[PDB]
Structure formats: C-alpha cells, structure tokens
Design an enzyme around this catalytic site. Structure first.
Site, PDB file in Angstrom:
ATOM      1  N   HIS A  42      -6.000  29.463 -33.429  1.00 26.09           N
ATOM      2  CA  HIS A  42      -6.427  28.657 -31.754  1.00 26.09           C
ATOM      3  C   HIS A  42      -5.382  27.238 -31.929  1.00 26.09           C
ATOM      4  O   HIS A  42      -4.815  25.979 -31.577  1.00 26.09           O
ATOM      5  CB  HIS A  42      -7.369  27.861 -31.425  1.00 26.09           C
ATOM      6  CG  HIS A  42      -8.362  27.199 -32.242  1.00 26.09           C
ATOM      7  ND1 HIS A  42      -9.006  27.077 -32.800  1.00 26.09           N
ATOM      8  CD2 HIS A  42      -8.302  25.411 -31.460  1.00 26.09           C
ATOM      9  CE1 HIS A  42      -9.978  25.946 -33.238  1.00 26.09           C
ATOM     10  NE2 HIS A  42      -9.177  25.148 -32.226  1.00 26.09           N
ATOM     11  N   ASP A  53     -10.548  34.123 -34.465  1.00 27.41           N
ATOM     12  CA  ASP A  53      -9.848  32.743 -34.774  1.00 27.41           C
ATOM     13  C   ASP A  53      -9.655  32.153 -36.579  1.00 27.41           C
ATOM     14  O   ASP A  53      -9.965  30.976 -36.629  1.00 27.41           O
ATOM     15  CB  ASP A  53     -10.960  31.812 -33.880  1.00 27.41           C
ATOM     16  CG  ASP A  53      -9.951  29.900 -34.098  1.00 27.41           C
ATOM     17  OD1 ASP A  53     -10.894  29.367 -33.706  1.00 27.41           O
ATOM     18  OD2 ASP A  53      -8.689  30.511 -34.026  1.00 27.41           O
ATOM     19  N   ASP A  68     -22.227  17.569 -36.971  1.00 26.35           N
ATOM     20  CA  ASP A  68     -21.065  18.266 -36.852  1.00 26.35           C
ATOM     21  C   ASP A  68     -19.418  18.090 -37.057  1.00 26.35           C
ATOM     22  O   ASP A  68     -19.190  17.086 -37.430  1.00 26.35           O
ATOM     23  CB  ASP A  68     -21.384  18.354 -34.999  1.00 26.35           C
ATOM     24  CG  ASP A  68     -20.826  20.042 -34.498  1.00 26.35           C
ATOM     25  OD1 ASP A  68     -20.469  20.884 -35.449  1.00 26.35           O
ATOM     26  OD2 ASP A  68     -20.766  20.384 -33.623  1.00 26.35           O
ATOM     27  N   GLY A 112     -10.669  17.944 -33.792  1.00 24.67           N
ATOM     28  CA  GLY A 112      -9.908  17.572 -35.124  1.00 24.67           C
ATOM     29  C   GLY A 112     -10.140  17.904 -36.760  1.00 24.67           C
ATOM     30  O   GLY A 112      -9.070  17.986 -36.825  1.00 24.67           O
ATOM     31  N   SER A 132     -10.243  21.080 -36.607  1.00 25.55           N
ATOM     32  CA  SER A 132     -10.097  22.957 -36.437  1.00 25.55           C
ATOM     33  C   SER A 132      -9.405  23.171 -37.334  1.00 25.55           C
ATOM     34  O   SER A 132      -8.159  22.468 -37.694  1.00 25.55           O
ATOM     35  CB  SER A 132      -9.878  23.073 -34.833  1.00 25.55           C
ATOM     36  OG  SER A 132      -9.968  22.948 -33.897  1.00 25.55           O
ATOM     37  N   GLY A 133      -9.554  24.365 -38.415  1.00 28.65           N
ATOM     38  CA  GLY A 133      -9.002  25.072 -38.754  1.00 28.65           C
ATOM     39  C   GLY A 133      -9.360  25.569 -40.461  1.00 28.65           C
ATOM     40  O   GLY A 133      -8.583  25.554 -41.205  1.00 28.65           O
TER      41      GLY A 133
HETATM   42  C1  LIG Z   1     -11.296  27.938 -30.276  1.00 20.08           C
HETATM   43  O1  LIG Z   1     -12.089  27.589 -29.113  1.00 20.08           O
HETATM   44  C2  LIG Z   1     -12.680  25.957 -28.787  1.00 20.08           C
HETATM   45  C3  LIG Z   1     -12.055  24.902 -29.212  1.00 20.08           C
HETATM   46  C4  LIG Z   1     -12.045  23.677 -29.360  1.00 20.08           C
HETATM   47  C5  LIG Z   1     -11.878  22.531 -30.209  1.00 20.08           C
HETATM   48  N1  LIG Z   1     -12.171  22.703 -31.115  1.00 20.08           N
HETATM   49  C6  LIG Z   1     -14.020  22.659 -31.313  1.00 20.08           C
HETATM   50  C7  LIG Z   1     -14.453  21.745 -30.792  1.00 20.08           C
HETATM   51  C8  LIG Z   1     -15.983  21.640 -31.313  1.00 20.08           C
HETATM   52  C9  LIG Z   1     -16.321  21.843 -32.668  1.00 20.08           C
HETATM   53  C10 LIG Z   1     -17.201  21.989 -32.941  1.00 20.08           C
HETATM   54  N2  LIG Z   1     -18.398  20.670 -32.532  1.00 20.08           N
HETATM   55  N3  LIG Z   1     -18.305  21.981 -34.097  1.00 20.08           N
HETATM   56  C11 LIG Z   1     -15.431  22.438 -33.378  1.00 20.08           C
HETATM   57  C12 LIG Z   1     -14.018  22.937 -33.023  1.00 20.08           C
HETATM   58  C13 LIG Z   1     -10.812  22.579 -30.231  1.00 20.08           C
HETATM   59  O2  LIG Z   1      -9.512  22.688 -30.661  1.00 20.08           O
HETATM   60  N4  LIG Z   1     -10.009  22.062 -28.587  1.00 20.08           N
HETATM   61  C14 LIG Z   1      -8.108  22.082 -28.713  1.00 20.08           C
HETATM   62  C15 LIG Z   1      -7.836  21.293 -26.975  1.00 20.08           C
HETATM   63  O3  LIG Z   1      -9.001  21.392 -26.229  1.00 20.08           O
HETATM   64  O4  LIG Z   1      -7.233  20.479 -26.746  1.00 20.08           O
HETATM   65  C16 LIG Z   1      -7.853  23.105 -28.435  1.00 20.08           C
HETATM   66  C17 LIG Z   1      -8.867  24.263 -27.882  1.00 20.08           C
HETATM   67  C18 LIG Z   1      -7.867  25.500 -27.891  1.00 20.08           C
HETATM   68  C19 LIG Z   1      -6.945  25.746 -28.001  1.00 20.08           C
HETATM   69  C20 LIG Z   1      -5.923  25.254 -28.563  1.00 20.08           C
HETATM   70  C21 LIG Z   1      -6.472  23.640 -28.896  1.00 20.08           C
HETATM   71  C22 LIG Z   1     -13.065  23.670 -27.849  1.00 20.08           C
HETATM   72  C23 LIG Z   1     -13.528  24.751 -27.213  1.00 20.08           C
HETATM   73  C24 LIG Z   1     -12.996  25.739 -27.555  1.00 20.08           C
HETATM   74  O5  LIG Z   1     -13.495  27.700 -26.750  1.00 20.08           O
HETATM   75  C25 LIG Z   1     -13.635  26.807 -25.746  1.00 20.08           C
HETATM   76  C26 LIG Z   1     -14.984  26.601 -25.054  1.00 20.08           C
HETATM   77  C27 LIG Z   1     -16.443  26.481 -25.805  1.00 20.08           C
HETATM   78  C28 LIG Z   1     -17.318  25.827 -26.061  1.00 20.08           C
HETATM   79  C29 LIG Z   1     -17.697  25.459 -24.581  1.00 20.08           C
HETATM   80  C30 LIG Z   1     -16.798  25.863 -24.097  1.00 20.08           C
HETATM   81  C31 LIG Z   1     -15.862  26.559 -23.704  1.00 20.08           C
END
Ligand SMILES: COc1cc([C@@H](Nc2ccc(C(=N)N)cc2)C(=O)N[C@H](C(=O)O)c2ccccc2)ccc1OCc1ccccc1
Ligand SMILES: [Ca+2]
Lengths: 52, 250
Positions: free
Chosen positions: B41, B90, B182, B186, B188-189
């Site tokens: 994503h 993903d 959590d 930012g 992500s990946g």
């Molecule tokens: C891949 O898928 C996704 C992603 C997102 C986020 N991430 C995350 C969150 C949280 C976490 C924790 N808490 N651990 C981790 C990681 C993110 O990354 N956001 C960003 C914006 O807004 O711009 C994006 C989305 C999609 C594609 C590209 C980019 C956000 C959202 C989504 O999906 C849709 C939904 C889910 C749940 C509930 C409702 C809706």
C-alpha cells in the site's frame, strides 16, 4: 518432531528422523541443533548488543 | 509508533526508511544486502517510480552521522492478488540498485522458513514494531526511530476483543485494545520482528488499523509466513526493466 518445541532445533527443522538447519551465515553445531554465525553480520543479530 | 520508546541507535539495524522525492513515505525491513520487504500500500500513489530511495542505518532524521546508506529502489514487486486501495496481500519486495554494506548499524533481519514461522514464531507472544511514524494519532511523526513491544492475537480472539476490512489469513493482529500502544500509518511497511532463541526474524509488516491506538482496536500486520516461498523465488530471479513488477501469487 518439528512441530513440538521446534524439534529441539535452534532455527529450522525438517522431518524425514529429524534434521535441523541454519540460515545462510550460520553453521550447525555437532549437537545437531545449535547454529553459530559464520560471518561478521549474520541476520537477526544486533552487533552492538552481541558485543554487550 | 504510539506508547513506545526510542530504539537505541544500532538496535534496530534492519529498519529501512523509504523516501519519495526526499519525503518520508514508509518503513521497510532489510532481509539481505539487496532486498527490502515493505507494504504494497506504500506504493498506491507513486507519481515517479524512479524517485524512490531506501535509507539504511538511519536513526535521527534531523542529522547526518555517517552511518546512513542510501540506495535507489530499482524494483518494487507486488503480488498479483494485491488490489490498490485495499488491505489484503499487503506486501512489497524491493530490490535496491546496489547492495548496502553490512555494518554494526546495518544488518538484515532473518526471513524465516514458512514452517518454522507458522509452527514456532507464530506462538511467540511479543514482537517489536518500529518506525518514524506518528507519536500520537493525528500527531507529528517521530524524528528518532521508535520501537514498541506488542503481543500477537489469534484472529478469532482479535475479533472478539475488538469493537472495517476483513482480517484474512494473510493478516494478524497485534497490540492493545486500551488505546495506549500501537504502530501508525507513518510506520506502514516497517518490521514486526520476533525473537527466538537469540535471533530475530521477520513475522509481520505494519499494514493497517482503525486510526492508531484507537480504543477497542488492534494494529493489523501482514502475515509474512504466507509469502516466504513467493519472496524466495523472486529473490532468485533476474531484474526486469521498469520499476514496478506485478508477480503471480501464489
Ligand atoms: C492499507 O490499508 C490502510 C492503511 C492505513 C494507514 N496505515 C496504517 C494505519 C494504522 C495502523 C495501525 N493502527 N497499526 C497501521 C498502518 C495508511 O497507510 N494510510 C495512508 C493514507 O491514509 O494516506 C494510506 C492508506 C492506503 C494506501 C496508501 C496510503 C489506513 C487505512 C487502511 O485501510 C482502510 C481502512 C482500514 C481500517 C478502517 C477503515 C478503513
Ligand atoms: Ca541520521
């Protein structure tokens, strides 16, 4: 054997009898379970902590 | 990362920072000297595929200390089953243009064998997630790399313990429903990394969630174990012209 406590292996396990294996950059010890690094930066080890 | 701590410099050496025109895009995980695992994503809105950069050995975004190593992303490989703008499958496998040099500050995380990951790693309760993502939902991103210990839940337990997308076999939950801790968008990946008998392994990718650290919700992670063979086959393949490659899954 491998599904229970990793077959005793430190890393990877194959059922055949049971063979443990190690990732690239490690070799298997004569105990048949332990893996020791063969390179300076084996995967999954943190050098500054390995140093202490 | 919400509710975690600074990862002491060098203690998260497989963490990757991905940049698009110098701007923070996503995290990732180094798995050997030329391959990085990230989230599909992260690439949903790529303008110029030729301006993607991976940084290793990064820690404090405000300074250059000389441990950083930057590489162009030469290939972004995404499974055929991933649909942009959705959550399932993903995962992205990135080939760097030139290998990084392993150092105390740059080390790959082990990509585990599937069976070991499913039989053994999947039952290690706590794992580390990390990144330069938001320190609070709707808040500023971190300048120093942050890391968080999170417990994994079986999917039926996750659903039972949660107050939008389906949680599939290609995902798992980890974290806390009390809104305290959590990973966030930012991050992500980035890696979800699991320790077993002295060695750390890649088990998850920061994927999605309902906001971040939202009461009654957990973080959702790509279940990397489903992709081990797919990754291993691709890592043996020759590079192809063009950055994006969609590759059949399974
Ligand atoms: C891949 O898928 C996704 C992603 C997102 C986020 N991430 C995350 C969150 C949280 C976490 C924790 N808490 N651990 C981790 C990681 C993110 O990354 N956001 C960003 C914006 O807004 O711009 C994006 C989305 C999609 C594609 C590209 C980019 C956000 C959202 C989504 O999906 C849709 C939904 C889910 C749940 C509930 C409702 C809706
Ligand atoms: Ca820096």
């Amino acid at each position: 054997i491998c599904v229970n406590e990793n077959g005793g292996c430190e890393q990877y396990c194959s059922d055949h009898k049971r063979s443990c294996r190690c990732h690239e950059g490690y070799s298997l010890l004569a105990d048949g379970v332990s893996c020791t690094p063969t390179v300076e930066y084996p995967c999954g080890k943190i050098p500054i902590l390995e140093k202490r | 990362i919400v509710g975690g701590k600074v990862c002491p410099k060098g203690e998260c050496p497989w963490q990757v920072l991905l940049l698009v025109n110098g701007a923070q895009l996503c995290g990732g995980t180094l798995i050997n000297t030329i391959w990085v695992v990230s989230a599909a994503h992260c690439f949903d809105k790529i303008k110029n595929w030729r301006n993607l950069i991976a940084v290793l050995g990064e820690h404090d975004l405000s300074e250059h200390d000389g441990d950083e190593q930057s590489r162009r992303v030469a290939q972004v490989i995404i499974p055929s089953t991933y649909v942009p703008g959705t959550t399932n499958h993903d995962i992205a496998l990135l080939r760097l243009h030139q290998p990084v040099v392993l150092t105390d500050h740059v080390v790959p995380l082990c990509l585990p064998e599937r069976t070991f990951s499913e039989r053994t790693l999947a039952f290690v309760r706590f794992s580390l997630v990390s990144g330069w993502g938001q320190l609070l939902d709707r808040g500023a991103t971190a300048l120093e790399l942050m890391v968080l210990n999170v417990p994994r839940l079986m999917t039926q337990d996750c659903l039972q313990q949660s107050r939008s997308p389906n949680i599939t076999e290609y995902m798992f939950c980890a974290g806390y429903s009390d809104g305290s801790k959590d990973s966030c968008k930012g991050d992500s990946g980035g890696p979800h990394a699991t320790h077993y008998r002295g060695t750390w392994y890649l088990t998850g990718i920061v994927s999605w969630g309902q906001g971040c650290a939202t009461v009654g919700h957990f973080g959702v992670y790509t279940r990397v174990s489903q992709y081990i063979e797919w990754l291993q086959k691709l890592m043996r393949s020759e590079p192809r012209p063009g950055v994006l490659l969609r590759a059949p899954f399974p």
